[PDB]
Each structure stands twice: as C-alpha cells, then as structure tokens.
Design an enzyme around this catalytic site. Structure first.
Site: not given
Ligand SMILES: Nc1nc2c(ncn2[C@@H]2O[C@H](COP(=O)(O)OP(=O)(O)OP(=O)(O)O)[C@@H](O)[C@H]2O)c(=O)[nH]1
Ligand SMILES: [Mg+2]
Ligand SMILES: Nc1nc2c(ncn2[C@@H]2O[C@H](COP(=O)(O)OP(=O)(O)OP(=O)(O)O)[C@@H](O)[C@H]2O)c(=O)[nH]1
Ligand SMILES: Nc1nc2c(ncn2[C@@H]2O[C@H](COP(=O)(O)OP(=O)(O)O)[C@@H](O)[C@H]2O)c(=O)[nH]1
Ligand SMILES: [Mg+2]
Lengths: 51, 431, 116, 34, 54, 436, 430
Positions: G10, G12, G62, G136, G170, G197, G215, G243, G245
């Site tokens: 993802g 994130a 993506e 994802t 979001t 978050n 972020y 790990l 443990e």
């Molecule tokens: N803690 C944290 N969460 C993040 C960060 N970037 C994205 N997220 C989380 O990602 C969530 C949304 O998902 P996306 O950013 O679209 O990424 P994804 O999970 O691959 O979803 P898709 O892009 O649709 O495939 C948000 O609700 C955030 O909580 C980050 O840098 N730090």
């Molecule tokens: Mg994504």
C-alpha cells in the site's frame, strides 16, 4: 411583588447540566469528551456480542 | 530529602509565587537561568545532571494574561514549561463556574503534573496551596483541588495559605458568596489554613516601613518572608528543628479548628534599623501586639488557645525562655483554662536574607508567629452578616444556579458554619 | 494481579519506600497449601463453563472518572471523637450515602475510628 | 450584627464537655461574667 | 541538544520567509492575470487585424 | 484567545465605530494602510482580540458594517482609516428605512439579515474561543433600531451562552431630531430587555455639555462626541488585551453589576477630561480621577443619580498605579455618601487596574454604574409615547406594514412593568425576609 | 545469521518504509549509494561488489508513490525488482484488491519473496506494514496472508497496522474494509500491533511542539518503534529479545492478538534541556493515557500482558525498582489470572537521530507493547459504524459487482460479534 416573584422563580428551578469537556495541553485546548473515545459509550449498546 | 510541593492557584497565588521563588533563588544562590554561578536546595529544586535546577511547583490559572508575564519575564528559563498550566476563559468571580464547569477540564492535567512531582520526591512532607477566597479560581477550583487530593493521597499534610477577605475593603461584590461556599469544602478536606488579609498588611507597611503607597509587589515580599521562615527549619541547620507535621498537630485541637493567624516581627525600614536594637524580648512582644497583627481582628476580645514561635538568626535559648516567662505574666494576654502549656518554639541558625529593591532591612534575628485564637468568631459574624444581607432578597443567585449547582447548597453552606459559630463559643467557654 | 512478599526483603519493596505516596494494593502475607491437581474451569477461548459461579461486577473495571465522581466527596480522615451524637451520625450517613466511591478502583476508603 | 431568624435554631456540632449539667453551669457562669 | 534546537529554530524561520515569498508571488500573478485585469487584447484574431475572437 | 466580534448598525453606528476603530489602531500601533509600525513589544501580544491576520504582516478589523443606505458606506470608506476594513464586510441595502422602525424590522430589514447572518457567522466561527459580540447603534433611527434589534434576537438564539454588549444611543429630551423618536425608542427597549447581557445608555445632550462646560471647546462637532464614547469602549476592554495587576474582563463585570436578568442598564463615564487652559492648574493623580469620575457632570446619561440610588458601581483604572490609594478612595466614597447607595448589597464598587495607559496620557479611569435613576429615562419616553398614541398619531406608517395595534400596547405595558421593578428595588425593606 | 524480510504493501506501507530504511542506513552507516564510507546482515545482503541491498519488498497497485523512490535520493539503494508496481489501484475497495486486481501480481510478489528467502540460513520472521482503510493495504494484504500461511508453515509474522481513528479519517467506505480484513486476519496472523494517526497527531502537537504535522513527521516516530523492537537482534545487551520471544508472551488466546504500542520519551531538544529522565520517569509515561498512541484509555480496561524494551545506559536494578512501583499503583489493574504480567528487554545502544528530524539526543528510551481489554470499545464503535451503514445497503453494489458474494458481509459481522463476546468473558473474575 417582584421580590417575591424573583425569589419564587429562583427556588422553583433546576440547575442546567454542563457538557463534559476535557483539556489536555498546558494551553487550553478544549475538546469534547463523549465522541473522543476516552469514555466507554458503545460498550453499553444493545447489540453487543449478539447477532 | 524533606521535600514540599507548592501549588499556586489563582492570580493571587501566581503573584505570591513570583516573589516567593525570587526569594528562594537568592537564598540558595541560584541565577535566573537556573544554574549555579551543599544540598539545602533539594527540598525545592531537582538536580538535573547538566547543572540546572527546576522548582517543584505548579502555576495553575484560568486566564492567560497573568502567566504570560512569567513566560516572558526574567525567570523565563528557570521554570519548567509544562509546570505553568493555563486555561482559556476565567471563572469571572464565580464559584459554580470554577467548580462545576471550568474547574473540571483542567483537574485532569493538574493531577497529572502533581503525580509526576510526587514520583520525583523521595520524602514528601506536604503540599503548600496558595489561593485567595474572593477570587473565582481560588474559590472554585481549589475546592476541587482539596477534594481530589484527599482521594489520591490519604493523610498527607495540606498546609494552606489564604488571602482572607478584609472586613471593610474588598475588590468584589459576590465575594461573600464565594467565601461561604469554600469553608464547607475546606472544613473536612484541609489540614491547616493560615489566613492573611490585604488591609492589615496595608496598615503595617504604612506605619512601620515609612512607605505611603505599597503595591502588590511589596506585599508579596512580606508573604514570601513568612513562608521562608516556616520552611527554613527544613532547609538550614538549627538547634531545635520543626517539621511541617509538628505545628499541624500543635495548632489543631478539634476537627473544626484549623484557622491560625500568621504575624511577622520585626518588620522595619533601613533607617530605623540603625536606631533600634532588636533583642529576643523586643521581637517577641511585637508579634503579641494587636497593632502588628496581619489579620484585621483584635485578639484581646478572644483568647489564645494555641501558639507557635519560629526564630531565625543569632538567638539564644536562655533568652527565649526568659521572654516567654515574661509574656505569661501579662494580664492582658489571656489563655484558655484547658491549655496550660500553650507554646511551641523552633530555632534556626541562618538569619533572614535581603533582596535588591526590597523594603525590609538587614536584621540579624526575626520571629514568625502562628497563633490560633477565639477572636475569629467576630470575623465570621461580620462575614455571615454581609452574606445574609444580600441573600435575603436572593441577589446574584441566578448567576450561580445557571452554571450547574442547585439552590440547596446556599442553605447548606450557611447552616454548616452557623453551627460552627455556636461551636467556637462552646470551645471558648471555660469550665 | 496479586503481589507476593519476599518475606525478608519486603521492607525494600513497599510503596512509600519505592516513592509511591498514594494508598496501596494489598500484599498476600500467607500462602495456602493445595493438594493434588486442579480441575479446569474454562473453555479453550477463555469462556467460563456454565456450571461455575460468576461474579456480578463490571468485567471492564471499577475506575471512576472526573465527571462520574460524587459532587460532595466525603473526606479520607474521619474521627468522631469530640463530636455530638447527631453530628457524627450525619457524617457517617454522608459516608454511607455513596457506595459507588467506596468500592471503586480508585476507592476513597475512610477509616471511621472512635465514638462520639 | 444581623442574621436570619431562619438560621438561628441550628445546634453545635462539637460537644467537648463531659455532661450537660457542667455545660449549663459553665454557660450560666459565662452569662453572669458577661 | 542545545545546538540542534538552535538549528531547528533556524529552519522554522526560513520556512516562514519562504511562505511569505510564495504569498507575494501568488498576489502578483493574480493581480496580473487576464481574468481579473479584464485585458481587451485577449479577444483578438491572431492572424487577422479586422477579425476578433468570438 | 478571547475574541470580540464588532458589528455596527445605522448611520450613527457606522460613524461612532469608525472613530472606535481609529483609537484602538493608534493604541496598538497600526497605520492606515494596515501594517504595524510601533516601538513596544507587548502591543502584539494580544492583537487577535480585535484583528485578523492577513498576508504580508498586515491586520484587518473583525468588524462588520450594516446599513440600509449606501450614503455613509461611501463616506466611511473615504475617511482617514477607511481603507483598513475588508470590502466584503460592507453590507448595505438600496432603499433606506426612512426613520421607520416597522420598515427596519418587518419589511426592509427582513431581507438584508439573510446576508448579515452569513457574514457574522463566518467571522465568529473562525475564532478559537469567542468571548462575545459588541454592537453600537442608536434607538432614534430606522435601520439601527429596527434591524439591529432583529440581529440581537437572531444571534442570541444561535449563540446562547455568549456575551452581548450594546452601546445604544438612547433619545434625548431636548434635541428633538425626529418626530417618531418615541415610537422607535419604545418598541426597541422592549426588545432590548429580553436578550441582552449588557447595555450602556449614551445620550447626546449628556455629551454636549461635557464638550461645552468641561472640555471647553468652541465648536463641538461629531468628531469630538465620538471620541468620548470610543474612549469608553476602549477602556472597558483594557484588561482583556493588556496586562495588569488586577484584571477584569466583560464577563467578570457582567456578573457583578447584574443582580437580576432584567437589571442590565449602565451609565458610562470617562474621568480625565480637561482643557488646555486648565491642564496646568491641576494634577491628575488617583484622588483627582475618582473626584471627577463620580461627579454627575461627567456622566454620559441625561439623568442624575443624585435623584436615584446606586445599585452597583464599577471602575477600571489604567496606567502604573498604587493599590492603597485606589482602595482607600473607593472605601471613602462609599462611607461618606451612605444614602445614595443600596443597603442590601454591601461593597457596591468593583475595581480593576490595567498597566497600559491610553496614548498621550499617563493615568486614566472609566466608570460603569448601575443605578436606579435610569428609570427617569423610561418614564420620560413613556409619557411622550402615551401622549401621542391616544390620537392614533403617525400610526398609518406602522399599521400599514403588517403591524397590529396590540404591539404598541404590550410595548408600553412591559415598559411600565419595567419601571415598577426598578422602583421596588430602590424602596426595598431593611433587614427582613419575605414570604418566599 | 538472524535476519528479517520486511514487506510494505500500500501507499501507507511504502511511505512508512521510506523513513524506516532511512533510519536503518544512518544507524549502520550505509551511504545512499549503497557502500560503506556485519550487524547489517539482518537487513542488508552483501554483493561481491560490496554493495548492500535491503531485504525489503515494496508492493503497490499504482506507480505514483513508488516513482519517488525510483527518482529520489535512495534510487541506487533498493533492488530494481523489489519495487513491484501494478497497473490500476484498488480504489478504496476490498473486493478489487482481493479478487480482481491482486490476483494478477500475487504470483510476482511470491516469486520475489522466495528469492529473498533463499538466502535465509536462519530466518526469524516477516514484518508487515499496511493500513486498514485503503484498497491495496486491506484487499491485497488479506490474500497475501492467506497464501503466505500455506507457503510458509510456522514462520512468525508481525503486523504494524494503522487502525482507523475514532474521530477523523480519509475515507467513507473505510469500515467495510476494516471488518473484511479483520475477519480474515483473526485466523491468518501471529501478532498484529496497531497505531492510530489521530493519536500521534495529539502526541506530536502536545509533546514535540509541532503545530502542523505531516505524514513525514509521523513516519519517523513509527520507525523508531520498529528499530527498538529489532534492536537486540543487532546489538548486544544484558537481556536479549527475539521476534519469537515477544510473540509468545503477549497472546494468551489465539483470538486475541491485538497489542498496543507506546514509545517514551518523545520530546524536543528544548524540553530535554529542562527535564532529566531516569528509567523510572520514562516507564511512568508508558502507562499514562496521555502518551498512548492508540486513542483509548487503558484505565477503563485491564492489562493482559506487557513487554518492555529498554535502550541505552540502563541499569537492571533501576528497571526492577520502577516496575515494582508500577505494580503497586491502584490505578493500573490486571486480570486475576496473570500474576506475572511483565517482560523486560535490555539493550546498550542509545537511539540514533536523523538530520532534519524532530527528536533529540537522549541516553535512554523505552518501548511498550501492552495487551489491553480496553480495546473492546474500539471494536464496539467500529461495529456500530459498519452496522449503521449496512442496514440501508450503502456502497454494497461496488463490492458485489467485483465478484464477492453478499453473504461475506453477514459472515464477517457474525465473526466479530463472537469476538466482542470474547473480550468480556476473558475479563471476568472467577
Ligand atoms: N500512519 C500513516 N498512515 C498513512 C500514511 N500514508 C497513508 N496512510 C494511511 O493510508 C490510508 C489510505 O490508504 P492509501 O493512502 O490510499 O493507500 P492504500 O492503502 O494503498 O489504498 P489505495 O491507494 O486505494 O490502494 C489513510 O487512511 C492513512 O491512514 C502515513 O504516512 N502514515
Ligand atoms: Mg494504494
Ligand atoms: N495579598 C495579595 N492578594 C492578591 C494579590 N493579587 C490578587 N489578590 C487577591 O485576589 C482577589 C481577587 O481575585 P484574583 O486572585 O485576582 O482572581 P482569581 O482568584 O484568579 O479568580 P478570577 O477573578 O475569576 O480570575 C483580591 O481580592 C485580592 O485580595 C496579590 O498580589 N497579593
Ligand atoms: N453620538 C453620536 N450620535 C450621532 C452620530 N451621528 C448621528 N448621531 C445621532 O443619531 C441621530 C440620527 O440617527 P440615524 O442616523 O437616523 O440612525 P439610523 O437610522 O439607524 O442610521 C442624530 O440625531 C444624531 O444626534 C455620531 O457620530 N455620534
Ligand atoms: Mg481566576
């Protein structure tokens, strides 16, 4: 007799209840307490643990 | 390791603490940056290993305009940033605002910080709470402070220093309403509560220190000297020590009797200090003088029912006993019949220190007296009078009822200390 | 859950010696001696069996927050030594009035000592 | 000065005397003194 | 730690100055944009003087 | 951290507050173009109370200007400090009320308030912790007394637990500028008593004699009159934005001079008022301030407290000042005049002291006094209302716009019940309970 | 020989592995080129040229977030075939990321995992970085776990999940993805820490004095938690942890595998100059509800198990004295069937600081992993959000059109209904 009417309206009254608010930072940052998630609200729901 | 946590609540408590902590830094040799240029400072300061010293005090208030002077003034680096707790909107001379609405969102953060200082301490003697009865935060939020502190800490000493409302002059209109309702909370949740009032210190500064116009800057210095005289037995080596627990036991004979009076002697200008000698006998009759009382009440109408003497500087125990034997033979001074030994003494070696810009002089010896009298009963007959005289037509009560308290508390708070007024005469009548 | 004494170094591990000035959780002074194996009373996931007695307290805890405590908190130091038989009765009634604060996880526990 | 007649029938919370007769004698002596 | 804190304060100051510069640039571009300036020479046929843009 | 939202109604409101936004701009050090040009460092410590940040280090006032005619909108903008207001805050209709309260409340002012409430909600919701709203208007007009009181009824329902201030200009018995002045005054004081926290009564003839006899000006134009009321508006909020020894904001004053919710009419005054020929003949220490402040000549309402009875008194001081003479002078003025004060409230005077003096001056004071003698104002309006209402006089401008005849009856009946309430508090019994 | 393959799925996961691998290179002294200017064997693989290659797999559907890694400072560091990018994103849909899009690239990512795992003489486990709210991060993660459990038998797997916040988020359809991931994760996971978050936003504003976080500011704080967890794997200490443990001592029942993370100290350089911090003062901030980075108060629940990770100049006795103080506090409560609920880990190396960061240089630090009954309100509120949408068939045509059946929604709600019944009966005293 406005003295008597004012005193009667005072004695026959109910105090309002304040909304629970908490402040975290050393500077006043007022947030509501009920929807924040620090007080158990959704535990006491009706459908807890049952389909 | 005999450490005390100071609580400064209200505008009065903060402004007292500015002069009080200015005095402590000069007393132990601490610059305003927080560092050095002995471990007697350990009861007030915590040694950071880099050489910094941090006071074990909190400054709590409901408005930002009184603490933002501290954050920008010359002691901006000594204090911890997180020990200066600041609200958003003040109680605005209200009890119900400072008790039920505004006092409750900050009581989480204050008890969080007090827990951290209590963890730092290795031996705790008690909490010193500074407030004023006539305010909003000192009236309301302090009542929650004592009530919550009794829950968290069971039997820890709670020494209190209060600005009592003066008899004829005051700066508020709903001040008697604020001051009735703080007694009811502080009867059972407070251990000892010294009182001073601003009017009596005005008379002392006018007649003794040859200054016509004092401000709050040079009344807070006099209050700081009293607090320093109490704590100096903990800090410095003395020939006879007194702890905070001692005169708690020695001044409170009954659960409703915890209101002693604080007076200081000598307090003179530098021009007269050249010209007067200051012996132990000459300073022990000044505190007994009704003109030198720091509370506007004459103890000649009442009777002394406990006493406590704290001596600083070049003092000899032999001349102390000769002075007390002299004051026991005066027929103007009257004691109760059930307290034949009504004195308690303490001796410390280090003389009081002088601060730049102060009004007092450099004197080798001084005394601080904590006397419990019966003459407060006239000070509560007057204060119940002016509370009654504006409660008869039910004035200003829509401001209190509309914030979260019902009307029944006013009848409870008046009835409780009306029974206490019958209690003071009941103790005062001899067998 | 349960603290156990070292029985010779217990003085070194008390509350105020470890700089904790609040009232304490109790310490098990004596240890009961069992005999034989123990019967098993719970499911694989942790559910209790239908036949075992169950306590009726809250399964999450008894912590009481800021906005849930009583408005008139009874004191922690209560001595009825020199009071009248009506005033001491009023104080012990005020103590008895709120059972929620006494049995809470925080739990202001007054010690009523003496007689009027 | 002046107080409500409503708040005039309240008693005393403490006792601090052995018996009631000694209290009454002490109060009578106090009234004679004053 | 003291030296690192001084560096952080410097970064914050530079960030604020950059923000103000960006605001000034945006104000200049908006005060010179055709949509707000109402320039009458936008509506002109490029290769014909007599014809005008519709 | 404690923001005040300013709102202005009518030609009188837009010409009084325009001076008000010039006196505190000089107090905080703001030139007419907007930026900051000053010397002290605590002038920017509390500037968010009245100002909003903008780009380039300039500031804009948190005020909105409301009118039903573009006549004074074109004049306030063309003034000296007229280029500091945001042009989106100017709201104005194209047809005037024409000194008619019915047009201002029911017909012409009923459509403009759909636009005014959007602007004031936009300005109020941006504030992190709002203190309250402050309104300047006159009761002798149509667009200030008619729509300005409808804003009060709408804001009070939207924001209940806030502070509402009204520096209302009440009619005068002698100027006689408009024929239908008692009609607009009676129907607006009836509305002002129910949904207002604090009200100040400014009178024009009480501002004329100060500029004539005390200040000794040859030509007392409206620039001088509005400087007096702007000095009082700046002095009432001086503990909110400037440090001091004993602070008091609007809420701490409101809880002390309002003992009952219908008792919220006050009396302003400004103490250091001297002329050029006499500025060297007298000193201006604390006794001289409190000697002039309590004097009936200095007061801004056209009715004498010497014929009345002081309910509660306030006094806010400015400049670096001793505490002992402040308390001594306040105790002395209570004790000597033992008959002009009430008896069922002890210590009628509330005291505040600020550390920053007004510009051009070293020491200053202001007066807020809740008095029973304010009922002289309402009886004087009532006797002129009930004189011309016997004849159906001037009614066809009001009753032809959806108004019944019963609104005038209830407007004078509650106003008659208002003066009966003030009377019994004056003649209340001594040291006695009641049937309650 | 011990080593760990990290997998980041993802947007994130990729944006949280960018900061995590930046910290690792500064910690081991690896240049962004990939060469030195033997403890790195747990996170880097040696080439005969001497270049170091991270053992991480970057997965996304993506190219708009992988391309910065392909362009920026660490372009030459990662392996070109470790950055796996699909064609079309899942677009906030569990069904798209699990059935119709994730199937095309699951064979490619499992081929790459097998090639990195071929170098494993001794392998500890996998570290997984994903979020519950994305397509994802939720849809692809679910069948990735399903096929990895079949492919690798009893290898330990750890999840660093981003839980949806109680108040901000979001996405609109995010509770559908949260329940449809949790239902699969209950049976196909070993341990799964969460982080929120919103709570780090409060931590960064209150403690670090950052008024406007981003972020990139949040990823450093989470990256410090990952470093302290695997610190003893790389550095020596008095008490070593593994790990395998801290997996065993935090999961009492195979239905409850949901611990909460906490880090202390998190302070700036200005505040660190004032306050000195012994290990007693840093372990008293782990149990503080104001320092918890999951928006829930542990005081309303009961602690099931705890794990303490210490770094720096730390003394074994002063750790023991501080824990006994925590054990005798009335406010901290345990259930009646864990008389011994703690675990300590001691390491010598103090935490490192990255340039341009917000944290300060400190001698000692502590990380807390706690299993708490007070997480049941987070599931109860998330239950209601899913319950309240699904009663009126909101956004259900998107999921059923991809290929999943309607009965999966009723089965997933049935699964966590028994999970909520589990959190009570565990915390019932005998
Ligand atoms: N803690 C944290 N969460 C993040 C960060 N970037 C994205 N997220 C989380 O990602 C969530 C949304 O998902 P996306 O950013 O679209 O990424 P994804 O999970 O691959 O979803 P898709 O892009 O649709 O495939 C948000 O609700 C955030 O909580 C980050 O840098 N730090
Ligand atoms: Mg994504
Ligand atoms: N002795 C002494 N008393 C002070 C000082 N400052 C304020 N006071 C007392 O405080 C009282 C007024 O209440 P404040 O303390 O100013 O205000 P507060 O307690 O914070 O409550 P609020 O007014 O609601 O903010 C006055 O009656 C003074 O007697 C001081 O510096 N010295
Ligand atoms: N104090 C003061 N009064 C003013 C000012 N301008 C006008 N007035 C008074 O307001 C009265 C007319 O009010 P008007 O303009 O009709 O009010 P409007 O209809 O609400 O705009 C006149 O008699 C003036 O005495 C001013 O700047 N200050
Ligand atoms: Mg206050």
């Amino acid at each position: 007799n406005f003295i008597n009417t004012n005193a009667a309206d005072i004695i026959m009254g109910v105090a309002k209840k304040p909304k629970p608010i908490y402040v975290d930072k050393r500077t006043g940052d007022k947030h509501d307490l009920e929807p924040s998630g620090l007080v158990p609200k959704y535990i006491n729901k009706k459908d807890y643990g049952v389909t | 390791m005999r450490e005390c946590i100071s609580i400064h609540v209200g505008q009065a408590g903060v402004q007292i603490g500015n002069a009080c902590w200015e005095l402590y830094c000069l007393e132990h040799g601490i610059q305003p940056d927080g560092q050095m240029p002995d471990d007697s400072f350990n009861t007030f300061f915590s040694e950071t290993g880099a050489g910094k010293h941090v006071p074990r005090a909190v400054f709590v208030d409901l408005e930002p305009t009184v603490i933002d002077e501290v954050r920008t003034g010359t002691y901006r680096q000594l204090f911890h940033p997180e020990q200066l707790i600041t609200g958003k909107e003040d109680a605005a001379n209200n009890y119900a605002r400072g008790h039920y609405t505004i006092g409750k969102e900050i009581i989480d953060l204050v008890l969080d910080r007090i827990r951290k200082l209590a963890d730092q301490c290795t031996g705790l003697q008690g909490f010193l709470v500074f407030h004023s009865f006539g305010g909003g935060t000192g009236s309301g939020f302090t009542s929650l402070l004592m009530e919550r502190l009794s829950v968290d800490y069971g039997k820890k000493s709670k020494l209190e220093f209060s600005i009592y409302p003066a008899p004829q002059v005051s700066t508020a209109v709903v001040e008697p309403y604020n001051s009735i309702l703080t007694t009811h909370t502080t009867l059972e949740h407070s251990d000892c509560a010294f009182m001073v009032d601003n009017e009596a210190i005005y008379d002392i500064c006018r007649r003794n220190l040859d200054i016509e116009r004092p401000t709050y800057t040079n009344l807070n210095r006099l209050i700081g000297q009293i607090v320093s005289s109490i704590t100096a037995s903990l800090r410095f080596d003395g020939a006879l020590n007194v702890d905070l627990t001692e005169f708690q036991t020695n001044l409170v004979p009954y659960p409703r009797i915890h209101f002693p009076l604080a007076t200081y002697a000598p307090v003179i200008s530098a021009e007269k200090a050249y010209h007067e000698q200051l012996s132990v006998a000459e300073i022990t009759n000044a505190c007994f003088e009704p003109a030198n009382q720091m509370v506007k009440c004459d103890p000649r109408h009442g009777k002394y029912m406990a006493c406590c003497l704290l001596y600083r500087g070049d003092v000899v125990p032999k001349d102390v006993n000769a002075a007390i034997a002299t004051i026991k033979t005066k027929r103007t001074i009257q004691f109760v019949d059930w307290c034949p030994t009504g004195f308690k003494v303490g001796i410390n070696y280090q003389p009081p220190t002088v601060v730049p810009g102060g009004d007092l002089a450099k004197v080798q010896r001084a005394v601080c007296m904590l006397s419990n009298t019966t003459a407060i009963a006239e000070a509560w007959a007057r204060l119940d009078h002016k509370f009654d005289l504006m409660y008869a037509k039910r004035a200003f009560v829509h401001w209190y009822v509309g914030e979260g308290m019902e009307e029944g508390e006013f009848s409870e708070a008046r009835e409780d200390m009306a029974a206490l007024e019958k209690d003071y005469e009941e103790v005062g009548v001899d067998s | 859950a349960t603290n156990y004494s070292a029985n010779q170094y217990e003085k070194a591990f008390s509350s105020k010696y470890l700089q904790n000035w609040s009232p304490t959780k109790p310490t098990k002074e004596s240890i009961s001696s069992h005999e034989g194996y123990t019967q098993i009373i719970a499911n694989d996931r942790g559910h209790l069996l239908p036949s075992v007695p169950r306590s009726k307290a809250n399964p999450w805890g008894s912590f009481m927050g800021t906005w849930q405590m009583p408005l008139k908190i009874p004191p922690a130091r209560v001595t009825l030594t020199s009071r009248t038989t009506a005033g001491a009765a009023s104080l012990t009634k005020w103590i008895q009035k709120n059972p929620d604060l006494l049995k809470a996880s925080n739990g202001l526990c007054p010690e009523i000592l003496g007689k009027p | 000065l002046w107080h409500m007649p409503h708040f005039q029938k309240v008693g005393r919370h403490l006792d601090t005397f052995p018996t009631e007769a000694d209290r009454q004698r002490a109060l009578k002596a106090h009234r004679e003194e004053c | 730690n003291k030296a690192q804190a001084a560096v952080q304060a410097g970064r914050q100051r530079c960030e604020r100055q950059r923000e103000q510069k960006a605001n000034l640039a945006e104000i200049q571009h908006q005060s010179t944009s055709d949509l707000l300036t109402e320039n009458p020479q936008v509506a002109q046929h490029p290769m014909a003087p007599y014809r005008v843009l519709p | 951290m404690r923001e005040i939202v300013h709102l202005q109604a009518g030609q009188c409101g837009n010409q009084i507050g325009a001076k008000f936004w010039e006196v505190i701009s000089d107090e905080h050090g703001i030139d007419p173009t907007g930026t900051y040009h000053g010397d002290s460092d605590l002038q920017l410590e509390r500037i968010n109370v009245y100002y909003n940040e903008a780009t380039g280090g300039k500031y804009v006032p948190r005020a909105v200007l409301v009118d039903l005619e573009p006549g004074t909108m074109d004049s306030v903008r063309s003034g000296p400090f007229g280029q500091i207001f945001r042009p989106d805050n100017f709201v104005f209709g194209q047809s005037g009320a024409g000194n008619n309260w019915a047009k201002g409340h029911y017909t012409e002012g009923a459509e403009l308030v759909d636009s005014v409430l959007d602007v004031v909600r936009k300005e109020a919701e941006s504030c992190d912790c709002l203190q309250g709203f402050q309104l300047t208007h006159s009761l002798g007009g149509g667009t200030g007394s008619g729509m300005g009181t409808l804003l009060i009824s709408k804001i009070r329902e939207e924001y209940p637990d806030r502070i509402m201030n009204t520096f209302s200009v009440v009619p005068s018995p002698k100027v006689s500028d408009t024929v239908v002045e008692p009609y607009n005054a009676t129907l607006s004081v009836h509305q002002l008593v129910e949904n207002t926290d604090e009200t100040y009564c400014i009178d024009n003839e009480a501002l004329y004699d100060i500029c004539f006899r005390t200040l000794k000006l040859t030509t007392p134009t409206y620039g001088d009159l509005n400087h007096l009321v702007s000095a009082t508006m700046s002095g009432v909020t001086t503990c909110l934005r400037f440090p001091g020894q004993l602070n008091a904001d609007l809420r701490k004053l409101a809880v002390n001079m309002v003992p009952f919710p219908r008792l919220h009419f006050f009396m302003p005054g400004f103490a250091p008022l001297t002329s050029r020929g006499s500025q060297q003949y007298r000193a201006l220490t604390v006794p001289e301030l409190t000697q002039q402040m309590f004097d009936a000549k200095n007061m801004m309402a056209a009715c004498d407290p010497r014929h009345g009875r002081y309910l509660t008194v306030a006094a806010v001081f400015r400049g670096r000042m001793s505490m002992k003479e402040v308390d001594e002078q306040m105790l002395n003025v209570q004790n000597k005049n033992s008959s002009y004060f009430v008896e069922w409230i002890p210590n009628n005077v509330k005291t505040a002291v600020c550390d920053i003096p007004p510009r051009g001056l070293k020491m200053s004071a202001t007066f807020i006094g809740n008095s029973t003698a304010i009922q002289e104002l309402f009886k004087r309006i009532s006797e002129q209302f009930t004189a011309m209402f016997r004849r159906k006089a001037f009614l066809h401008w009001y009753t032809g716009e959806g108004m019944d005849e019963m609104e005038f009856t209830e407007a004078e009946s509650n106003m008659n019940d208002l003066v009966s309430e003030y009377q019994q508090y004056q003649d209340a019994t001594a040291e006695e309970e009641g049937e309650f």
